[PDB]
Symmetry: C2
Subunit: 330 residues, 2 copies
């Protein structure tokens, strides 16, 4: 099996001919620039690279890359800047002056975020470069969360051989109550659909179907009710159930004994952790002790997708995250 | 490798000739009775089986077991009952009458617990039989936690091939603050020593050494300080450190990057989870996705050890848990 290639093949079938454009603000980053050349040579994702044109071209030359067919935009000299300034001023509802917007939009991450907001591109991948802060920051200001969603959350694809799961929230929210967990469950189901999965979402705990009693157990039980309510409202093509211990969620024989007649019978493929402590630890255990590759974090909940690279990313990481982001944009 | 046999070999070297006696209250349980015969045929653990003598002998016959060399005690007719009644009345400080004690001590779990308290046996393993409640309940009343320990906690040996880790608290305490986590860390270190390990205890979080800020991160940071204080006080032969994400605790290269100069460098063998949600989920992930066997739960913190079997245990589980309990008694 080749789990990463198999995930990409599902995303490619969705993306083929859709012409999705992903902004890569960090054109002076070697990994990003090289990944842009690779994406350009597919049909699925069109990279829009930002930076100083002379510096980016010099870096390409150093790297022995032909970037002549890549769209490369320097914010300060772009014919689009004027419209993006005006839109950013309108979006900010008077919180930013025209002069401030003219200044801010010279920043590659702000400019890139505005390309997405203005419909000139579909999503954005950044974070490889030290000068990029949190990729998500301008996105929160400009793009915002989707109607009905309070906050972003972070998911990972956990992949090994022929197995592919989604785990979340593993990165973002350190304090979660029932409403927050239910939000994560619904967003994760939607993300799983974007990625071509048939979502079966287990809300995890140390209890299975009332086997323990505590405030944290009640929290997850109430989250299941709210998530099911939100899903059914929207006729989401997903099953959401809980509370389950991890084995009851993923082992049919355990489910049969501990959760008889539940909607899930040990066949979950999306796992919602009851806290960030649990999720961060749990994906790291699956990664190291299970030998699963952890692809992410992938952000969900925004009106348009943006995702954040590690400073230590590889070229392949940029390529893969660009595909994931492009799939999210559909 | 044979991870379970290898753990038993360490425990056998400690137990050889020490004549440790483990009470098995459930002599009318097939698994327990068969395990008693197996333990009797070693030198390490002496089983003290309780029950109605005629019923236990009839069950042995049905099972084709020779139990003639096993110590078998019927509480109601035991020559020891009178002394155990008097001791139980004294231990209860007037909360139980002599008549009530005479009645209660006919119960195999109470009688067995009193054998331990009175120094007639060293530990106790129960829980296979439906009529046994929580094995620990009489223990809490009679044996109690060790001086300086508030509560029991539950650990698992996570074993695969040549790898052996301790995870806790994975079973008992649904609400833990810094003091409670520090208690678990110190008890787990002590348990690891009992089991022949050189304990390197990582206190887990979603943060590594200040990489995130939240109340839950502060909780674990403060727990590390308190645990180190308690360990150093007692010149415990253990290292306790944190806070660590799971990969920083167990992967040297991650530790070097994320926790430079920390006391642990990716070489933890004892893992203290920041909550029961995290621990219960985390061991189940290690078990199912990692293919680790999870041996437990093993209780720690009592003045004398008692441990609890699943109703669905095997014969081997009773045998193994008897060895673990006997090791704890040293
Ligand atoms: Cl559902
Ligand atoms: Cl669990
Ligand atoms: Cl990355
Ligand atoms: Cl230490
Ligand atoms: Cl972690
Ligand atoms: Cl068991």
């Amino acid at each position: 099996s080749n789990a990463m290639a198999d995930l990409l093949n599902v995303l490619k079938d969705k993306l083929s001919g859709k012409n999705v454009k992903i902004v890569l603000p960090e054109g002076e980053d070697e990994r990003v620039l090289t990944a842009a050349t690779q994406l350009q040579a597919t049909d699925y994702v069109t990279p829009i690279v930002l930076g100083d044109e002379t510096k980016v071209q010099s870096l390409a030359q150093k790297l022995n890359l032909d970037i002549s067919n890549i769209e490369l935009i320097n914010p300060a000299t772009s014919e689009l800047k004027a419209e993006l300034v005006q839109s950013f001023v309108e979006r900010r509802k008077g919180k930013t002056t025209e002069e401030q917007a003219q200044e801010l939009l010279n920043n590659v991450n702000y400019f890139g975020t505005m390309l997405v907001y203005a419909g000139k591109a579909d999503g954005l991948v950044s974070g490889a470069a030290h000068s990029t802060g949190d990729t998500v920051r301008p996105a929160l200001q400009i793009i915002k969360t989707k109607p009905g969603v309070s906050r972003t959350s972070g998911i990972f694809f956990m992949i090994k051989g022929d197995e592919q799961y989604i785990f979340g929230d593993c990165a973002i929210n350190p304090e979660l109550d029932s409403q927050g967990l239910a939000e994560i469950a619904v967003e994760s189901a939607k993300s799983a659909l974007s990625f071509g999965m048939d979502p079966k979402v287990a809300m995890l705990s140390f209890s299975t179907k009332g086997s323990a009693k505590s405030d944290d157990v009640t929290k997850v039980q109430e989250a299941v009710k709210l998530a099911q309510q939100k899903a059914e409202e929207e006729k989401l093509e997903a099953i959401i159930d809980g509370e389950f211990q991890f084995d009851a969620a993923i082992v049919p024989g355990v489910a049969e004994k501990k959760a008889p007649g539940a909607k899930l019978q040990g066949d979950a493929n999306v796992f919602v952790f009851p806290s960030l402590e649990a999720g961060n630890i749990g994906y790291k255990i699956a990664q190291r002790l299970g030998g699963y590759d952890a692809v992410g974090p992938v952000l969900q909940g925004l009106n348009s997708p943006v995702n954040d690279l590690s400073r230590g990313c590889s070229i392949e990481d940029v390529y893969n995250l660009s595909f994931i982001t492009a799939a999210q944009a559909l």
